[PDB]
Amino acid sequence: KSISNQVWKFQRYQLIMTFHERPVLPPPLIIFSHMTMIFQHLCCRWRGLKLFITDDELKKVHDFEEQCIEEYFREKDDRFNSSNDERIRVTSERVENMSMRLEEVNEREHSMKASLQTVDIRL
């Protein structure tokens, strides 16, 4: 069911382009249009989503594409940086940094306590 909806939606393209390729007249009376195609080859021998766009319009569609692609990559990066995993990893690693740096603060304050008690004795 799911794959068949996908394949039908994909096969719609070939359906539309086949009926764009097919001539104006139905098969019981298509022989006139075939004859006119032979006539078109005669006048050539004697003498469709390609929507062509002018250059300022292509300038428009290119900066629009640039906006969409940068918005995509920002979007996915900010979903990554706001989803829970990144929060957990970042929080734990800076807690590691908290532990070691406040350890340095603690031992340094031990040196400061000895120094200030000695200075109080010295006054």
């Binding site: 390609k50 766009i53 629009f64 969409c68 692609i69 918005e71 995509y72």
Partner: peptide, 22 residues
């Protein structure tokens, strides 16, 4: 797919032109 969906959500009309232009 993801860039096409993104172009759909910004402006639909230019997304068609992005899909058709030569």
């Amino acid at each position: 797919v993801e860039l096409l969906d993104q172009s759909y959500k910004q402006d639909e009309q230019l997304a068609m032109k992005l899909l058709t232009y030569e």
